[PDB]
Design a protein around this ligand. Structure first.
Ligand SMILES: *[C@@H]1O[C@H](CO)[C@@H](O[C@@H]2O[C@H](CO)[C@@H](O[C@@H]3O[C@H](CO)[C@@H](O)[C@H](O[C@H]4O[C@H](CO)[C@@H](O)[C@H](O)[C@@H]4O)[C@@H]3O)[C@H](O)[C@H]2NC(C)=O)[C@H](O)[C@H]1NC(C)=O
Ligand SMILES: *[C@@H]1O[C@H](CO)[C@@H](O[C@@H]2O[C@H](CO)[C@@H](O[C@@H]3O[C@H](CO)[C@@H](O)[C@H](O[C@H]4O[C@H](CO)[C@@H](O)[C@H](O)[C@@H]4O)[C@@H]3O)[C@H](O)[C@H]2NC(C)=O)[C@H](O)[C@H]1NC(C)=O
Ligand SMILES: *[C@@H]1O[C@H](CO)[C@@H](O[C@@H]2O[C@H](CO)[C@@H](O[C@@H]3O[C@H](CO)[C@@H](O)[C@H](O)[C@@H]3O)[C@H](O)[C@H]2NC(C)=O)[C@H](O)[C@H]1NC(C)=O
Ligand SMILES: *[C@@H]1O[C@H](CO)[C@@H](O[C@@H]2O[C@H](CO)[C@@H](O[C@@H]3O[C@H](CO)[C@@H](O)[C@H](O)[C@@H]3O)[C@H](O)[C@H]2NC(C)=O)[C@H](O)[C@H]1NC(C)=O
Ligand SMILES: *[C@@H]1O[C@H](CO[C@@H]2O[C@@H](C)[C@@H](O)[C@@H](O)[C@@H]2O)[C@@H](O[C@@H]2O[C@H](CO)[C@@H](O)[C@H](O)[C@H]2NC(C)=O)[C@H](O)[C@H]1NC(C)=O
Ligand SMILES: *[C@@H]1O[C@H](CO[C@@H]2O[C@@H](C)[C@@H](O)[C@@H](O)[C@@H]2O)[C@@H](O[C@@H]2O[C@H](CO)[C@@H](O)[C@H](O)[C@H]2NC(C)=O)[C@H](O)[C@H]1NC(C)=O
Ligand SMILES: *[C@@H]1O[C@H](CO[C@@H]2O[C@@H](C)[C@@H](O)[C@@H](O)[C@@H]2O)[C@@H](O[C@@H]2O[C@H](CO)[C@@H](O)[C@H](O)[C@H]2NC(C)=O)[C@H](O)[C@H]1NC(C)=O
Ligand SMILES: *[C@@H]1O[C@H](CO[C@@H]2O[C@@H](C)[C@@H](O)[C@@H](O)[C@@H]2O)[C@@H](O[C@@H]2O[C@H](CO)[C@@H](O)[C@H](O)[C@H]2NC(C)=O)[C@H](O)[C@H]1NC(C)=O
Ligand SMILES: *[C@@H]1O[C@H](CO)[C@@H](O[C@@H]2O[C@H](CO)[C@@H](O)[C@H](O)[C@H]2NC(C)=O)[C@H](O)[C@H]1NC(C)=O
Ligand SMILES: *[C@@H]1O[C@H](CO)[C@@H](O[C@@H]2O[C@H](CO)[C@@H](O)[C@H](O)[C@H]2NC(C)=O)[C@H](O)[C@H]1NC(C)=O
Ligand SMILES: O=C(O)CC[C@H](NP(=O)(O)OCCCCc1ccccc1)C(=O)O
Ligand SMILES: O=C(O)CC[C@H](NP(=O)(O)OCCCCc1ccccc1)C(=O)O
Ligand SMILES: *[C@@H]1O[C@H](CO)[C@@H](O)[C@H](O)[C@H]1NC(C)=O
Ligand SMILES: *[C@@H]1O[C@H](CO)[C@@H](O)[C@H](O)[C@H]1NC(C)=O
Ligand SMILES: *[C@@H]1O[C@H](CO)[C@@H](O)[C@H](O)[C@H]1NC(C)=O
Ligand SMILES: *[C@@H]1O[C@H](CO)[C@@H](O)[C@H](O)[C@H]1NC(C)=O
Ligand SMILES: [Ca+2]
Ligand SMILES: [Ca+2]
Ligand SMILES: [Cl-]
Ligand SMILES: [Cl-]
Ligand SMILES: [Zn+2]
Ligand SMILES: [Zn+2]
Ligand SMILES: [Zn+2]
Ligand SMILES: [Zn+2]
Lengths: 694, 694
């Protein structure tokens, strides 16, 4: 028989291993010839595997690269202007790769050019609350200083945004061993820790879902009108560069000025972690000088788009997508995900060759330029937004399959919760000590839900990956699953070798997943979700799970507001409408579920499947969130302080944030009330899509 | 049998007459108790007639009324400050109505309060080109002057916008006999001409599709957050008041300064039509003084919404809507339309009582507060936008059924052209001399198409009526039909008694349509369209007709640009992408039509009906047009110079308009190129919705 079990049994750990090896022998940086050749290879193989059509969709987007003949570096200079210490021009390459060409040296993509010289201020993780502490509590002024911040906790683009608004004239990012060196493990190549010469690459844009900086709203096709660089979306205005902890120690060791305010500001290096500004007495005349010469350049990128046409509902799309471009070899990010996608396509294709087709159409995507700001997935979604609006059932992302080997990590819309629970109860756990137990059992034991006994944790989607346009802009139900580490406080920081030259096939094969069993488990979860979404007669979404979470989020936002009782009295700030809407949604969702269980009539079925499909779509506000027009979902948005984290009722959350500091409280509380109205209205409107249609 | 002929035969002229009488005995001004009672009556009767559900949907919106104890008027004052002439405080009521209460005196709704005193400038119709002529050619400065303009040619809100941007401190609108007194016909009550004491009421907002000025984007429900008045959408900043031609003559007769520039500036009164500023020598010290004391007030309004549930596709809506509120008795506008809607509901209900139901759901709407800016239809569409987005098949408007008795006038999306041609070939002409001929035959003879022999004229939709939110904001295929006059140059001016106390039942019954045969013909056209849209198996839309018009509009916009060949060379302005997209749309539409004719499979049918339904939707750009976020359709928008007229490729049209006067041509031509890109992209994206789905 051709059922989910046939599909799942065809998936093989050894094939995933072979594909991962094949994808990680050379760098595949977006916009380079090597990544175009890999795109052509995947296109060819997906056709071989049995897909109906496989095409490349290309766009010309703004990318950023170092200048090969004028390298980026940071110096300490003396009063004479002699450079007495220079940071590294490249990471020492790993064993056997010391002769690989085209390894991009560490840089921060989209940094402007400059050579700013100044006194250092150390800003911890450069979070909003770190800048509050510096400026409000310690009275340290970052204006015209070079800020040095440790990576970790929040997206690096937010750090740069925060440093820019503090008045900094440059930003140095570094990896502290406190965040990137696990105690008791060896550094690469002898273990999975970051060596002192390792450096995390990555873009520092603040695009807020815009996609290519030059073409917000529209695909960057052959006739596109491009903004001039001065009007581009999201580019930083100050130079930025990343370094490793051997170089960081040389910059930090001389720091003077104020002591760190507390131990949460101190990393693991043998330095005081003084905040500055500037160096201690003996070195007070030395300065730090950045030399950044990278260039932004419009460059062609290529997505591979494979189609497996549905037998019954070919105009309903279930999309499995993940990126193909990497900073260097991409051993974990993204090729551990891409190898899983490749084996899923192979498996679906095996069933297709035997005469099977899914009920709905499945689209498979290998996205380009994810690492430069989700560019490939966003431009393609801008080009196809009308088809996706009206036909998109769900998007399952497929970036890195492992970032650890401890347990599963799932983030998704509440509409998918029941599907994920049910599927993981049918899959085998790969974990030691759980042989013969379900994946649901191991996952629930290792990652218990904070509010429900005997359930696992499932998080909110934010951004920082290719689902963002489908979920936050277009309102298509989205989900993701991967294996992760125990390390909770590092949940946004990345594994130690993240975006470094050391993230190789050998890293994965020796230290993460030698048997490829975690990869296989992730392939089963992602593939199984796609299979059920594409083949179930009734779409496998449960609206009642949205009702439960909406109440939780309403309680949460009300609790934030209730820290200001006097202002709520003064300005008559009521959450009554929002709770009313949530109560209505709960009542209507319950009734719809009864009809769904209780309804041979394919028009009623498809009418009901359309109500299911358009329910996520109903949370979209076509006017977007304040000053973020491409984040349109009213229940979830990426946090304005950390793109990686999701925020619920983001319009109200941002209106309340730091409200006690606003200099016109009447205006600020008016905006809280406006956002409560928008949220209550959108919840009620979404509820009404589940009422009887006439 | 229950087919269209059964439906059409049930419609009766005598019932329409009875309903019109019943709806026009007292005023039904929006927000008044009389109009709430009429709403309750219609709700009751629609239930009686057989609808499944009939509800009132209420909103609290900003309305405007004169102050009953402090009347509006205009004076000529002398140097001493004595008021030597005053305009009328009310229109002399018509015979038998001299004791009717609650006739609102003439005023311009939403005028601010003020008592500005100054010199008059006469600005013709106050059109964009009239202000260009004054300011660029005649060198007359309107700053700080009171402008007097004749009604006609363009929406009165555009005149006020134009006067405001010219620096005027007040606007006086009047009805010139050249535009409102047809030669050889008697004035009311002895004929259908405007008497010298008659005055046209009407709002002067510039909402650009926003709906209630205080709640743009969201319905004005019980918990809505309202903008403060200073941030409201669309309100004029200078006082405005309308007067009749007896009063106008007293203001114009003393005008001095410059002669009118040519005969197109001279109306039919016995005055010089001097432009001013100010009065001739003897009266040079007299001034004009306005006294406006109207107030804006948030007031409850009520729409009646009736549902006839579809038998097969109840989640697909065909909507027949028209307004119920009138300025005074509403004998033509809107009750000649509302009486037709009432007879259509009665007829559908007769079939329902015999066991019939339409294939799709039909919604019937009696909208409130149309006269104050499309408020009722827009607030309801804001409340229900998600349901309408995903389920709305078509909207047929039903305002005034006659504005004359010469021939049919149809404005609609190209998707409806074939439906209108086919239906009018099956209906009988009511016209004298065409007995036994089709309505298509009489219409085609009296109103020939400018580009096609043997076809009738069908115009573009603009705005100024309740279809605006459904078509221009939400992208739902829309159409309208009514009987009209021969008078081409008055096509936007209104019939003579438009918005006057004289527009009564007797006007209609004596001078427009004594037998009610034109009303019956309009009921057949509107009802027949609704019947076919709601009952045809395949939706009756022809995408190939959009391809034909898109080529016409592309040729038209290219021709405007080609008046500037040097700039097109300098800035490399190419329309090649737009013509390419139009060519692709033509090719794909042809192929889709073949499949549609060539395809027992209800999934393929509904898949194809969805492609038909979502085709109008594909022309919506979610970012809206420049500075007009609620006009989102890329092919059509209301003209920025005249809300009543439609403009094609409005983004490019507005970018090119008066471009030779812009002081940064590089920037202005860059914006032309940006709009060509948006238009070519949207045409191609819409084309792609008609491709095979997978
Ligand atoms: C959740 O769903 C419920 C339906 O179960 C829905 O209830 C609706 O609530 C509104 C607001 O409370 C009701 O609106 C009232 O409607 C009546 C006429 O039906 C009006 O007369 C009322 O206005 C008077 O009273 C107001 C309040 O004191 C005054 O401000 C006003 O000036 C008037 O004097 C009022 O508009 C509505 O009838 C119910 N509908 C029902 C029960 O069917 C509720 O709104 C939903 N929640 C959300 C957030 O949408
Ligand atoms: C109407 O539909 C047609 C399809 O019938 C569609 O044609 C497409 O047009 C684009 C642009 O002309 C083609 O894009 C080319 O794609 C190839 C690879 O397939 C590229 O190599 C080309 O780029 C090179 O040449 C450019 C132009 O000189 C250079 O600027 C560039 O730097 C490269 O050297 C180019 O991108 C596309 O292949 C066809 N697709 C087909 C034929 O299937 C047309 O775009 C549609 N019209 C609109 C308005 O969408
Ligand atoms: C995840 O798995 C659960 C457990 O199987 C699914 O819930 C079950 O769904 C079925 C089918 O809808 C329900 O069966 C129904 O029983 C009622 C009796 O009340 C009957 O009227 C229907 O004809 C039908 O037989 C069953 O009650 C329900 N079990 C529960 C909620 O415990 C769930 O749907 C799955 N989630 C998915 C597919 O997203
Ligand atoms: C308006 O009326 C015209 C004239 O009847 C309609 O066009 C006609 O539509 C029918 C049905 O689609 C076409 O018949 C078809 O003939 C082909 C042979 O090519 C065959 O393959 C199909 O099975 C079917 O019998 C007919 O050709 C066509 N006539 C034309 C274009 O002159 C038109 O559809 C009506 N418009 C509406 C309903 O919006
Ligand atoms: C990338 O950098 C090259 C090389 O920069 C030169 O060598 C560096 C080590 C340093 O000394 C720089 O200041 C040098 O200019 C740039 O190529 C130079 O460009 C200039 C003017 O544009 C030209 O006159 C020089 O001859 C070039 N020098 C060499 C050695 O080729 C090039 O501009 C940069 N590429 C970019 C910005 O895309
Ligand atoms: C730190 O580096 C500077 C600059 O070195 C140049 O650029 C580097 C990226 C690398 O490619 C070097 O080989 C280049 O020479 C050194 O300062 C330079 O020293 C040279 C030779 O003594 C001198 O002629 C240049 O004028 C100097 N340039 C500048 C900008 O000062 C410096 O010595 C290095 N410091 C240490 C401690 O190694
Ligand atoms: C509507 O107008 C009334 C009446 O206006 C008064 O009578 C006019 C003919 C003229 O002489 C005005 O200047 C008068 O004020 C307003 O009622 C008055 O309001 C004021 C102060 O608000 C009060 O002291 C007076 O007693 C009132 N006069 C009378 C005769 O009732 C009323 O404000 C207006 N309604 C509005 C603005 O909604
Ligand atoms: C034109 O009208 C003004 C004002 O008249 C008042 O307001 C009108 C709306 C109407 O309701 C009148 O009955 C009101 O008296 C006249 O000027 C007023 O005249 C009266 C009586 O002589 C005097 O006491 C007031 O002060 C005047 N008010 C003002 C504002 O000047 C004027 O006489 C009328 N002109 C003509 C030619 O009839
Ligand atoms: C990755 O695997 C692919 C597919 O097997 C390899 O590409 C093939 O290479 C052979 C031998 O050079 C050719 O004959 C085929 O035409 C290629 N097939 C394609 C591109 O579809 C590729 O060599 C492998 N890459 C690495 C680094 O091992
Ligand atoms: C318009 O017609 C309606 C409906 O026939 C009339 O309202 C009815 O009036 C009778 C007699 O007063 C009542 O018994 C009914 O209850 C009313 N029915 C309703 C409101 O549904 C109304 O009188 C007519 N109006 C005019 C001005 O002729
Ligand atoms: O520009 C964007 O929005 C994101 C681009 C890019 N996304 P990507 O590296 O593929 O994935 C984000 C991973 C977040 C850090 C992390 C956290 C836990 C485990 C592994 C990695 C980035 O974060 O740099
Ligand atoms: O605010 C709006 O957009 C329009 C409100 C309102 N619409 P409405 O009077 O119902 O219909 C517009 C009629 C336009 C003038 C006209 C033109 C020809 C025949 C009759 C009437 C108005 O134009 O004042
Ligand atoms: C920080 O420094 C600059 C002076 O160099 C000044 O303009 C700015 O206002 C300062 N801010 C504070 C908060 O002291
Ligand atoms: C993978 O699991 C192994 C053995 O179960 C553990 O020793 C190792 O540290 C884990 N690898 C990572 C990268 O966490
Ligand atoms: C019109 O009049 C005012 C002076 O009262 C002046 O400010 C304005 O610039 C004038 N405009 C022109 C074009 O003369
Ligand atoms: C209606 O038609 C009649 C007779 O056919 C004509 O005399 C009359 O003027 C028309 N009425 C209007 C308002 O045009
Ligand atoms: Ca773009
Ligand atoms: Ca509103
Ligand atoms: Cl993922
Ligand atoms: Cl109409
Ligand atoms: Zn990634
Ligand atoms: Zn990455
Ligand atoms: Zn009207
Ligand atoms: Zn009107």
């Amino acid at each position: 028989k051709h059922n989910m079990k046939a599909f799942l049994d065809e998936l093989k750990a050894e094939n995933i291993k072979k594909f991962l090896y094949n994808f990680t022998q050379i760098p595949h940086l977006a916009g380079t010839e090597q990544n175009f050749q890999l795109a052509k290879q995947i296109q060819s193989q997906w056709k071989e595997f049995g897909l109906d059509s496989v095409e490349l969709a290309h766009y010309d987007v703004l990318l950023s690269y170092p200048n090969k003949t004028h390298p980026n570096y940071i110096s300490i200079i003396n009063e004479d202007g002699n450079e007495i210490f220079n940071t590294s021009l490249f990471e020492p390459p790993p064993p056997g790769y010391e002769n690989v060409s085209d390894i991009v040296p560490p840089f921060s993509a989209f940094s402007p050019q400059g050579m700013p010289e100044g006194d250092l201020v150390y800003v911890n993780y450069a979070r909003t609350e770190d800048f509050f502490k510096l400026e409000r509590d310690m009275k340290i002024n970052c204006s015209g200083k070079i800020v040095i911040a440790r990576y970790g906790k929040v997206f690096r683009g937010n750090k740069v945004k925060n440093a820019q608004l503090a008045g900094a004239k440059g930003v140095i990012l570094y990896s502290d061993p406190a965040d990137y060196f696990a105690p008791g493990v060896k550094s690469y190549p002898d273990g999975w820790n970051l060596p002192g010469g390792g450096v995390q690459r990555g873009n520092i844009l603040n695009l807020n879902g815009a996609g290519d900086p030059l073409t917000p709203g529209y695909p960057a096709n052959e006739y596109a009108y491009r903004r001039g660089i001065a009007e581009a979306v999201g580019l930083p205005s100050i130079p930025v560069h990343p370094i490793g902890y051997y170089d960081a120690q040389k910059l930090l060791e001389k720091m003077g000025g104020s002591a760190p305010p507390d131990s949460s500001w101190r990393g693991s290096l043998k330095v005081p972690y003084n905040v500055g500004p500037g160096f201690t007495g003996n070195f007070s005349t030395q300065k730090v000088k950045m030399h950044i010469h990278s260039t932004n350049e419009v460059t062609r990128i290529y997505n591979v788009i494979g189609t497996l046409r549905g037998a019954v509902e070919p105009d309903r799309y279930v999309i499995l997508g993940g990126h193909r471009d990497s900073w260097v070899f991409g051993g974990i990010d993204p090729q551990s995900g891409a190898a899983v996608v490749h084996e899923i396509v192979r498996s679906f294709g095996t069933l297709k060759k035997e005469g099977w087709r899914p009920r709905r159409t499945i689209l498979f995507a290998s996205w380009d330029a994810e690492e430069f700001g989700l560019l490939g997935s966003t431009e393609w979604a801008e080009e196809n937004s009308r088809l996706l609006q009206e036909r998109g059932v769900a998007y399952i992302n497929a970036d890195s399959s492992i970032e650890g080997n401890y347990t599963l990590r799932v983030d998704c819309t509440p509409l998918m919760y029941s599907l994920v629970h049910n599927l993981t109860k049918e899959l085998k756990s790969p974990d030691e000590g759980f042989e013969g137990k379900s994946l649901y059992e191991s996952w629930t034991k290792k990652s218990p839900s904070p509010e429900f006994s005997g359930m696992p944790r499932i998080s909110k989607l934010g951004s920082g990956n290719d689902f963002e346009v489908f979920f936050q802009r277009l309102g298509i139900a989205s989900g993701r699953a991967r294996y992760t580490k125990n390390w909770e406080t590092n949940k946004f920081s990345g594994y130690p070798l993240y975006h470094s030259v050391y993230e190789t096939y050998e890293l994965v094969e020796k230290f993460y997943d030698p048997m490829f069993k975690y990869h296989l488990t992730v392939a089963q979860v992602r593939g199984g979700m796609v299979f059920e979404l594409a083949n179930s007669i009734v779409l496998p979404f449960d609206c009642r799970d949205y009702a439960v979470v909406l109440r939780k989020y309403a309680d949460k936002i009300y609790s934030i507001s209730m820290k200001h009782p006097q202002e709520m009295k003064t300005y008559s700030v009521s959450f009554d409408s929002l709770f009313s809407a949530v109560k209505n949604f709960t009542e209507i969702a319950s009734k719809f579920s009864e009809r769904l269980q209780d309804f041979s009539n394919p028009i009623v079925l498809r009418m009901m499947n359309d109500q299911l499909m358009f329910l996520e779509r109903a949370f979209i506000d076509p006017l977007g969130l304040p000053d973020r027009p491409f984040y349109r979902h009213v229940i979830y948005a990426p946090s304005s302080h950390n793109k990686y984290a999701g925020e619920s009722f983001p319009g109200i959350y941002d209106a309340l944030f730091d409200i006690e500091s606003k200099v016109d409280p009447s205006k600020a509380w008016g905006e809280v009330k406006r956002q409560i109205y928008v949220a209550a209205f959108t919840v009620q409107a979404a509820a009404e899509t589940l009422s009887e249609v006439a």
